[PDB]
Design a protein around this nucleic acid. Structure first.
Ligand SMILES: [Mg+2]
Ligand SMILES: [Mg+2]
Ligand SMILES: [Mg+2]
Ligand SMILES: [Mg+2]
Ligand SMILES: [Mg+2]
Ligand SMILES: [Mg+2]
Ligand SMILES: [Mg+2]
Ligand SMILES: [Mg+2]
Ligand SMILES: [Mg+2]
Ligand SMILES: [Mg+2]
Ligand SMILES: [Mg+2]
Ligand SMILES: [Mg+2]
Ligand SMILES: [Mg+2]
Ligand SMILES: [Mg+2]
Ligand SMILES: [Mg+2]
Ligand SMILES: [Mg+2]
Ligand SMILES: [Mg+2]
Ligand SMILES: [Mg+2]
Ligand SMILES: [Mg+2]
Ligand SMILES: [Mg+2]
Ligand SMILES: [Mg+2]
Ligand SMILES: [Mg+2]
Ligand SMILES: [Mg+2]
Ligand SMILES: [Mg+2]
Ligand SMILES: [Mg+2]
Ligand SMILES: [Mg+2]
Ligand SMILES: [Mg+2]
Ligand SMILES: [Mg+2]
Ligand SMILES: [Mg+2]
Ligand SMILES: [Mg+2]
Ligand SMILES: [Mg+2]
Ligand SMILES: [Mg+2]
Ligand SMILES: [Mg+2]
Ligand SMILES: [Mg+2]
Ligand SMILES: [Mg+2]
Ligand SMILES: [Mg+2]
Ligand SMILES: [Mg+2]
Ligand SMILES: [Mg+2]
Ligand SMILES: [Mg+2]
Ligand SMILES: [Mg+2]
Ligand SMILES: [Mg+2]
Ligand SMILES: [Mg+2]
Ligand SMILES: [Mg+2]
Ligand SMILES: [Mg+2]
Ligand SMILES: [Mg+2]
Ligand SMILES: [Mg+2]
Ligand SMILES: [Mg+2]
Ligand SMILES: [Mg+2]
Ligand SMILES: [Zn+2]
Lengths: 127, 63, 23, 206, 97, 60, 17, 83
RNA sequence: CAGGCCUUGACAUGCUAGGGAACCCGGGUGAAAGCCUGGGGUGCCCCGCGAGGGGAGCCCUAGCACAGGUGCUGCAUGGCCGUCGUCAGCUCGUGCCGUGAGGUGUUGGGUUAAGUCCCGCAACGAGCGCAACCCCCGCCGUUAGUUGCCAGCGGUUCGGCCGGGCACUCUAACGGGACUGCCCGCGAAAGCGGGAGGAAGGAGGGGACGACGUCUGGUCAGCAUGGCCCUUACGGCCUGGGCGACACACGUGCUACAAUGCCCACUACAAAGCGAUGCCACCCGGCAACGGGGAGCUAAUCGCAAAAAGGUGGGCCCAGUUCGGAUUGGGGUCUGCAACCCGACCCCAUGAAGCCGGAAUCGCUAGUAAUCGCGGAUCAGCCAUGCCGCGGUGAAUACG
């Protein structure tokens, strides 16, 4: 049956269900190479199952809400790395040298009063 | 529709009209200032023209 | 460009609708 | 001028509001006026009792004002009759059933709002300002407090040049949130202007 | 048979959500445990000084929290019991069918 | 031009366009919140005091 | 000789009204 | 410009001052404070003293001043240039 | 500001004398305000088969005490704020040194983001500061399971729609978790370099928090307040005007000068907030602004709402242009008593300067800069390109 993982990068949450098969991947009922047509950073989400040669071994059914398509990619790349090791825990090594187990916790810094943005400050002129 | 030459003539007749009756838009057209309630303190270059820089209020000396 | 009320870009800027950005 | 209100800084931590209720957007404000108008009357009429904290509770179409007075003999009056003529005066503003408790004062020398008023009156009554501050801070620390700070600002002694005078004992960590600092303010009118009196009592931490 | 409670401080809200659930868990049966609906937050940004120092503001929030609780089986021993309970001043109650 | 205008705000006026908020505490005609009926100054004064239900110095 | 700034030529007083 | 679904605007109190003149054989020099009034085709041939905030400017109306408000014909700032 | 008006006054207390009211609908004049007005009809306890006359919410007429002043002094003041500066500092008690001002401690070696901490010492401690307790974010748990979710079977008009379920996602409350704890290496120690586990490592990222003090800093126009000043007026009501002026100069910004772009069609992905004379689904009229109808929502349910950059497809072909969108003509829409001065928006027409900016000068060290759109406060509407927030995409460089 299924080996699951949750994924998160930057307000984007994705839910991954690793299942065995040829290689069919699917996100939100639309196909993968559909959903991420043209977005050249697509192949990046699948990099975990290449560090364990699981490529053509598996299939993947996935859901995404939150963030944008790129944040979803780094999320999927996390949840699948988590779904993979929650298929066997020997995969942990060779997946940690490549940061696959860790969460990219970089987030949109809040805007501060007295500024134009978070750190971009208004323009100065002594006189 | 009415065009190139005649369209200009009708535009020119309209503007002419406003000035002859002596209304506000007509007075803005003599002094050639903005007509649609823009500020004039500090822009209007399209409507005023090249900057005619003049001298300012002389800063007091020390001592 | 965004100053151009007569396009879909200008209408998004001024946040209005019309012939050039209907809803 | 820099430092933040010591109480405003610890709401939700060391300090509770002085009004407790919920109200929808459609009339939070109307309530708020009554409250401010309420304490208006009581801080006006019950100054002589030595007032320290008006706690206004609300549920629906009624109210429970709790007055924290130093000498509750002045509040309740000759046989439940003063407290009555006011519980009646409150209806004329409230309209609703104005239920009015009087709560005892633990130790008045541990009420920052009280200390302030005691000093403000002494400076209102022509006493030495510096002395009155050192005395006030003594009486607090003796009442078993962990620190005290009193600050006078204005035309002290009538001096044309306005001045800041203060005195502090024990410890007062205004940067520490687990510290329990009773803060109070009193204003003191004189023939030559006004003086502000800030009293800080440190009651221990949590 | 549903109740929704609202307040500016959770620790009052979360408290009377419980003491309601249990009371119909006294005269049962089915009581649907208290859900925490999303907190609706109203902010105020304010020039810190009374005059002219515009780049110095202080913030303020006003949070209305939201708890909903369901009792599936009436039991008129609680459609009685509840009416007399202990609901502090920080909370408001609505009851549904 | 203060007290006469604290009063004149309360009056109901010839046209409804002439109706403006004023602070109910101090009487300021600017930066008044309809939620409280308070100006941004008074707001901050009564806030730090605790006299403002469920209002709390946000920080995030 | 009346209200507020600018001065009307008498100490304290200005031109308004 | 005003919705033509709504009424072409005159203050009413100035328009009656006119129609009476029309009737009992106009014209007196009519003064008003309604700069916001529209020049109405009845008004032609009269002179209307429009307040500019300071004085009542005499305005003689003609068939072609009709579209406008009376305030368009009594300006409020006196300028005459710097120099 | 001009004009027209009121004089115990727009507002508070209190005292008289008269009407004897109260209050709600009118009328004449006038731009309105105001001046002159016309009606009806009040309890309250009362002697009442009586004529009735008192007294009392509160109104009005005169008449006092008083109100009113955003008039002056921030160099008389409180309060609150700016600022040096989140900088690592400022001090006290006792002892000791010095005739004394003062010194010592707080200096010194090492270390730290830090008067952080270690060692040393005529000093030994203590207080205000730093750090910590508070908040948001990053991993995990418990508690919950509708209005939110849909893993695996049952229906299914193919919408989690219905059975159903709370695994998951989320929501929102209580906990856990990182400590230089462990391994090595330096060292007197504090720590410092490196490694392992781990979501996170050396304060994890961000916030709130601002020492004794400085600047006779700011604010008598938010408020408070001493003193000076005005009293049919420096007070109060009104209509209109002005705060929007324009030979000029400066600041902070918005939009651009284009092809890494501009345009049209189709098609994806957010977060935080607002919303019962409010948000407006949806249907129709209109090229459109908008209008008429019209469901749902006291709102994790209904609505604002489409996010935009993106992706796909076509068009432009290096031109002051399908780049740019000022300026002016015309025609409309809505809000509002009313858009002349002086509103936003819509459509036809117009289509300026601008070919990357002299001397000069600003910001930012990472989810930052840049770029992209979205919300809110205020608000009838709006001159917001402002401000406070929100997430999308996402660099370059740091030798020293
Ligand atoms: Mg979150
Ligand atoms: Mg951003
Ligand atoms: Mg500056
Ligand atoms: Mg102008
Ligand atoms: Mg000389
Ligand atoms: Mg005197
Ligand atoms: Mg600014
Ligand atoms: Mg208004
Ligand atoms: Mg206002
Ligand atoms: Mg001047
Ligand atoms: Mg000063
Ligand atoms: Mg000051
Ligand atoms: Mg000044
Ligand atoms: Mg120093
Ligand atoms: Mg000493
Ligand atoms: Mg000696
Ligand atoms: Mg010494
Ligand atoms: Mg030492
Ligand atoms: Mg030092
Ligand atoms: Mg030193
Ligand atoms: Mg020293
Ligand atoms: Mg030394
Ligand atoms: Mg530091
Ligand atoms: Mg569970
Ligand atoms: Mg701190
Ligand atoms: Mg000064
Ligand atoms: Mg003042
Ligand atoms: Mg004064
Ligand atoms: Mg006046
Ligand atoms: Mg006026
Ligand atoms: Mg201005
Ligand atoms: Mg310039
Ligand atoms: Mg701008
Ligand atoms: Mg909107
Ligand atoms: Mg051209
Ligand atoms: Mg050229
Ligand atoms: Mg062109
Ligand atoms: Mg174009
Ligand atoms: Mg036009
Ligand atoms: Mg206008
Ligand atoms: Mg070119
Ligand atoms: Mg450049
Ligand atoms: Mg430039
Ligand atoms: Mg930095
Ligand atoms: Mg752009
Ligand atoms: Mg906006
Ligand atoms: Mg608005
Ligand atoms: Mg404008
Ligand atoms: Zn105020």
């Amino acid at each position: 049956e299924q080996y699951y993982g949750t994924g998160r990068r930057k307000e984007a949450v994705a839910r991954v269900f690793l299942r065995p098969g040829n290689g069919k991947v699917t996100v939100n009922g639309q196909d993968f190479n559909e959903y991420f047509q043209g977005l050249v950073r697509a192949v990046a989400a699948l990099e975990p199952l290449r560090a364990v040669d699981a490529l053509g071994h598996f299939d993947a059914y996935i859901t995404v809400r939150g963030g944008g398509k790129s944040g979803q990619i780094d999320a999927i790349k996390l949840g699948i790395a988590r779904a993979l090791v929650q298929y066997n825990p020997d995969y942990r090594a060779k997946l940690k040298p490549l940061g696959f187990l860790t969460r990219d916790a970089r987030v949109v810094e809040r805007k501060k009063y007295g500024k134009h943005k978070a750190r971009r400050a208004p323009q100065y002129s002594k006189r | 529709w009415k065009l190139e030459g005649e369209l200009r003539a009708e535009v020119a007749a309209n503007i002419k009209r406003l000035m002859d009756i002596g209304c506000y838009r007509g007075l803005r057209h003599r002094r050639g200032l903005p007509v649609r309630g823009q500020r004039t303190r500090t822009n209007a270059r399209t409507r005023k023209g090249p900057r005619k820089t003049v001298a300012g209020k002389k800063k007091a000396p020390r001592k | 460009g965004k100053g151009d009320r007569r396009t879909r870009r200008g209408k998004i800027w001024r946040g209005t609708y019309g012939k050039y950005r209907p809803r | 001028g820099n430092k933040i209100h010591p109480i405003g800084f610890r709401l939700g931590i060391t300090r509770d509001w002085e009004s407790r209720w919920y109200a929808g957007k459609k009339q939070y404000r109307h309530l708020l006026l009554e409250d401010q108008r309420i304490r208006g009357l009581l801080e006006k009429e019950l100054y002589s009792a030595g007032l320290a904290r008006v706690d206004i509770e609300r549920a629906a179409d009624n109210v429970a004002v709790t007055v924290h007075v130093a000498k509750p003999g002045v509040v309740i009056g000759r046989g439940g009759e003063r407290i009555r003529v006011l519980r009646e005066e409150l209806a004329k503003l409230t309209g609703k059933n104005v239920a009015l408790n009087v709560q005892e004062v633990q130790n008045p020398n541990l009420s920052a709002p009280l200390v302030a008023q005691r000093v403000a009156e002494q400076i209102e009554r022509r006493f030495a300002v510096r002395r009155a501050i050192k005395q006030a801070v003594q009486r607090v620390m003796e009442s078993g407090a962990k620190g005290a700070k009193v600050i006078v600002s204005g035309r002290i002694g009538g001096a044309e040049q306005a001045r800041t005078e203060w005195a502090a004992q024990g410890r007062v960590p205004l940067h520490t949130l687990r510290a329990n600092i009773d803060y109070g303010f009193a204003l003191a009118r004189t023939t030559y202007g006004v003086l502000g009196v800030k009293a800080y009592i440190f009651l221990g931490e949590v | 048979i549903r109740i929704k409670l609202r307040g500016f401080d959770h620790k009052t809200l979360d408290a009377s959500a419980q003491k309601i659930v249990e009371a119909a868990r006294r005269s049962g049966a089915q009581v649907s445990g208290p859900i925490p609906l999303p907190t609706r937050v109203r902010r105020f940004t304010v020039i810190r000084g009374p005059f002219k120092h515009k780049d110095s503001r202080e913030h303020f929030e006003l949070r209305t929290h939201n708890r909903l609780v369901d009792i599936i089986n009436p039991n008129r021993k609680t459609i009685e019991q509840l009416m007399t309970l202990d609901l502090p001043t920080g909370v408001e109650i609505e009851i549904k069918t | 031009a203060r007290k006469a205008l604290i009063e004149k705000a309360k009056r109901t006026p010839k046209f409804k366009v002439r109706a403006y908020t004023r602070c109910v505490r101090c009487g300021r005609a600017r930066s008044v919140y309809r939620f409280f009926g308070l100006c941004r100054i008074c707001l901050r004064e009564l806030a730090h005091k605790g006299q403002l239900p469920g209002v709390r110095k946000a920080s995030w | 000789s009346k209200k507020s700034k600018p001065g009307d030529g008498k100490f304290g007083r200005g031109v308004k009204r | 410009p005003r919705s033509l679904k709504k009424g072409v605007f005159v203050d009413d109190h100035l328009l009656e001052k006119v129609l009476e003149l029309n009737a009992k054989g106009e014209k007196r020099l009519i003064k008003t404070w309604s700069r916001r009034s529209t020049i109405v085709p009845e008004m032609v041939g009269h002179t209307i003293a429009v307040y500019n905030g300071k004085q009542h400017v005499p305005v003689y109306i003609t068939e072609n001043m009709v579209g406008h408000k009376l305030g368009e014909f009594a300006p409020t700032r006196t300028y005459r240039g710097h120099g």
